[PDB]
Structure formats: structure tokens, C-alpha cells
Amino acid sequence: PNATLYKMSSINADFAFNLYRRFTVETPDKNIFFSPVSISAALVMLSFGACCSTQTEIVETLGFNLTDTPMVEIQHGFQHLICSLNFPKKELELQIGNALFIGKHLKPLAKFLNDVKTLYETEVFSTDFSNISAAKQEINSHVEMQTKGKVVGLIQDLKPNTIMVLVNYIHFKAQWANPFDPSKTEDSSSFLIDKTTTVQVPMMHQMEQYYHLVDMELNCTVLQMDYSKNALALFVLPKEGQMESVEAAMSSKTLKKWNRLLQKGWVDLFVPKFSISATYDLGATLLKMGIQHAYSENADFSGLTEDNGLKLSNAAHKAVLHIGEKGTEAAGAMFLEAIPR
Amino acid sequence: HPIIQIDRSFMLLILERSTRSILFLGKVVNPTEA
Ligand SMILES: NS(=O)(=O)c1cc(C(=O)O)c(NCc2ccco2)cc1Cl
Ligand SMILES: [Ca+2]
Ligand SMILES: [Ca+2]
Ligand SMILES: [Ca+2]
């Protein structure tokens, strides 16, 4: 049902902004780009096979309160979420899915495999990790294929004793409801990257009716550009010197407020055409956030294999974005690595 | 009409409306970085 769905997404959005804020410390005054839903969906899948404090730590770190939303509701909500995101939408490409690469000698529970395959858009591959170089290439090429060539080389290093890899991928490709006319794009326009330094970017230009606002509390301009179906982009432009304050304030509550306040009217709009890429080593970050037992010699993944024979060792994310006159294409992938417990 | 010029650091969100999910989140400080 939808009440549970909207709860999952609000909790997921607050996780997104909290992780965003951790990134602003890890890589300060640098481009940030990730798929929050990819990261959340990967860890929820891992939690399906976890028990006791290993399981509770994962969903609590993702933002959930088990009194408010019991474990089984979380499981159902995410299963609903993935299903809804993947439902066919006219001229919107949106795919989110998982792949499990299980070592030849692991003893996975039929229950866990049947569940991920039928309820969580997962493909399961028996993988020979004794050829670690071949396994890395196999996983990287699969991710590349499922992201339409956009996420290349997700895994740079794979531990030699790896016995399981869980990957989530997301690919998104949509046209703007109002595409830009490339004859109006200014080939070299200035973009301020710090107080005394500009870079040159193509600047797209159109005068159109857009949902927009100035947030009078947060001192930022918000501009919404719709995609032709079910989806939108929000550009948040802080006033001079206010980026830090805006980053500190962002939450699901902010989006709920903007949903009400946004009003459609004429805007003379200038938007850059650009692409960016980002990568995150998330192992230590997720530990700091509260995922502890998953990494330990007493990791409880008794729902995943017969012998409870694995533990989490590493995690990483890669995401890419391209924005131009026709629309947006974005993709992301989350990698979780396991070794013998 | 009001002018909006995205010509300095900005945050970006891509959301899916029916689920109200944030699919992508980011900040663009230098759009020409490689
Ligand atoms: N999940 S949430 O609480 O962050 C959220 C919640 C809502 C909501 O309306 O409750 C929402 N509405 C659509 C919207 C907001 C701004 C532009 O479009 C979007 C989001 Cl991402
Ligand atoms: Ca400028
Ligand atoms: Ca028009
Ligand atoms: Ca806050």
C-alpha cells in the first residue's frame, strides 16, 4: 500500500541528505553525485539475509525505526518500491535491479535466492572467484551492460578471498518536457567555481513556464524542470555564501514544503550543458554510520547461507550524469563485497 | 520575467513522482571536471 511506500521514500530521502552531508566533509567543495536509492536498495537486499543485530543495524543505519516500521514492513515497502520504479512509463527509461554473484562453493539458502529473484529484481550468477581477475571483469561488464554502457569499471580492486558480490544498478534516461533549442545554446559561457575563478561551459537558454520559488528561510532559488513523464529535476541555487547553510537544512521536510510552495510561471532560464562522474569508497563510512556487525567475525547472515559463512568486507558506489538540450541520462551502481567469516 | 541563471555552484535532485523517491542527488561545483 501507498502509506508504507511514502514512508520508505521519506526515510530514504533523509538518508540521502545525511549521506550527502558526510560526503561534503569527505570531499569538501567538490562535485558530489550519487544515487541514494541505489545505495539503500543494495543494503536492504543484504539485510534480507541478515538476522538479529546484524539485520537491525543495517535498517537502522538506513534511517528506519523498527517500532514505527517493523522489519517485515520495510521488506515489503522496498519490494513495492523496486516494482513501482520498474513499471513501464511512456518515453521514460528507468531500470533498477540487482545482481548476486555467488561463489561456486557457497551454500546459499534456497529461500534467500528465491526471494531476491522473485521479489527484488535479482539475477543470480554462480561465479568462480578462484579467477579473481576474470570475476571482476565479469561483474564490471554486467554492470556496464545494465547501465547502457554508462557505468564503466565499477570495481577497481576485488579482494582475492572474495566469495560473494552483491550489485545494485540504476539507469535513467528521460527527455525534458520542454527541450532546449541547441541554436540558443551559448557555446562558451562563464560558470563560477569559486570566488575568483570561472570555467567555460555551454549555457543552454530558454524562456518558459517553470515551477519555481525563492525559499525565504533557506535563501535559495529552486527551479523545477519536468521530464515528459512521472519525473522531474530540481536545481537548488543558494544565494551568495549560503551553500553550507542550505546543505545543513536539506531533509524530506524541505521537499514536502517545496512541493506546496512551488508555483509555475515565466522564467528566463540559463542552464549549463555538462557531464559529471563521482566514485565513493563506502566501507568505512557505512561502519561509522552504524553498520558494525556485518563486518565482524560474528556477522549474522544466517538467512543467506547454510553455514553463515561470510562477512561484509568492502562497499563502493559510482554514479554518472549527463544534462543537455534533449534531456538527462544518469546511472549508478552499488557494490557490496563479502569474504569468509 | 524573472531571470534564473545557473552560473555557479548548485545542488541537483532527480525525483520520481509516484513513489516520491530521490533517484539521484548531487552538487555541481565545477561542471567541467574530469
Ligand atoms: N520522499 S520525500 O519526503 O523527500 C518527498 C515528499 C514529497 C511530498 O510531496 O510529500 C515530494 N513531492 C514531489 C516534489 C517535491 C518538490 C518537487 O516535487 C517529493 C519528495 Cl522527494
Ligand atoms: Ca559567472
Ligand atoms: Ca514555449
Ligand atoms: Ca536537517
Ligand SMILES: [Ca+2]
Ligand atoms: Ca525545511
